[PDB]
Amino acid sequence: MKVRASVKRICDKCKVIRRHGRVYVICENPKHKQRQG
Amino acid sequence: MKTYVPKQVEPRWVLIDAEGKTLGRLATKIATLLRGKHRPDWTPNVAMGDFVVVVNADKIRVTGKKLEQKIYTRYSGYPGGLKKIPLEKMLATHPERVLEHAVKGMLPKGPLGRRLFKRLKVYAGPDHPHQAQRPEKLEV
């Protein structure tokens, strides 16, 4: 998981979801998984 | 003429079903009743309020996410002795304290203020031991 102030889509298959008051970015590629913070 | 000051009268007893009422908005009225500020002969330097019996305090109700976010706090005087207790848990363990803390913070500080708090009888569960006083059902 990456934890950043700037979470962005990295590849066309990335997906910005919002869960529990937090912006995540989940994806098929494990490297792309992000959490804001 | 000098302002009327009442001699000691028989204090009224009162019953309130806390069930489904919003914690704070009920506490306020209980406090007023405790101060006797509903009585036209109110006097600020003696206890002449009502006695207030509250039932179903375990079913007090509350808005927002306060059930898991509202923190009750206790400092013991010892290093690291700050205890934090959530609403949810207070209800789960000592539910009457929830409403008791609320009213207490809305009564005056000082000796009289402590005496008024004493006339507040609060119970979890529909019943109360004070049928002896036969307290008047109040809708609030």
């Binding site: - | 005087g77 010892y78 290093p79």
Partner: protein, 204 residues
């Protein structure tokens, strides 16, 4: 949960499988139940046990009353065991078989006014290199203007010992029912002649 009153009698080692095993001998039996605490009456469950026979010349009327309502000889010591309800009217050492692990409570030896070194295992001061009358003193006890006070709980000199102490999970090495002895492996709070409580262990 089960328990018994008793007095600490002394220490020895016995031999068991080519091993020396340190033991404390305890005289536990026999303890008559003189009251039972019940949820409908007392709100909790326990047994008030009596221990050691007393000269009726020394037992007063409110005390006599209590004993008689239980049909019991005047006893010197009255003490409860919680969540213990023996089928009998009398509790003896036989409720403990060897191999069981037990919890022993007694009154620790009193050191009276104890310095900070004995009490709290402080380091004290140097005995040379300029040390000035501080060889057994406790050092600093605080900070400065912030917080400008001393913590509740600050370890300081003061009375030490003569307090309730429980040591836990002691082995029952043997039991001699004909003499009301219990043999427990290791050390037990307090002096010989000291009253001790023996309960089945709370450890697992």
């Amino acid at each position: 949960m089960k328990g018994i009153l008793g007095v600490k009698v002394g220490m020895t080692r016995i031999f068991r499988d080519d091993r020396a095993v340190p033991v404390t001998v305890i005289l536990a039996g026999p303890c008559p139940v003189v009251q039972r605490r019940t949820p409908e009456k007392d709100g909790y469950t326990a047994v008030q046990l009596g221990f050691l026979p007393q000269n009726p010349k020394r037992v007063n009327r409110p005390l006599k009353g209590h004993f008689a309502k239980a049909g019991v000889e005047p006893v010197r010591i009255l003490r409860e065991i919680r969540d213990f309800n023996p089928e009998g009217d009398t509790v003896t050492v036989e409720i403990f078989k060897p191999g069981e692990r037990v919890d022993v409570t007694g009154t620790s030896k009193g050191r009276g006014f104890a310095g900070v070194m004995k009490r709290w295992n402080f380091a004290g001061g140097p005995d040379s290199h300029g040390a000035h009358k501080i060889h057994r003193h406790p050092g600093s006890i605080g900070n400065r203007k912030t917080p400008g006070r001393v913590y509740k709980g600050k370890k300081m000199a003061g009375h030490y010992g003569a307090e309730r102490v429980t040591v836990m999970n002691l082995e029952v090495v043997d039991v001699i029912p004909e003499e009301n002895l219990l043999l427990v492996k290791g050390a037990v709070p307090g002096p010989n002649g000291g009253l001790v409580i023996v309960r089945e262990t709370k450890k697992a």
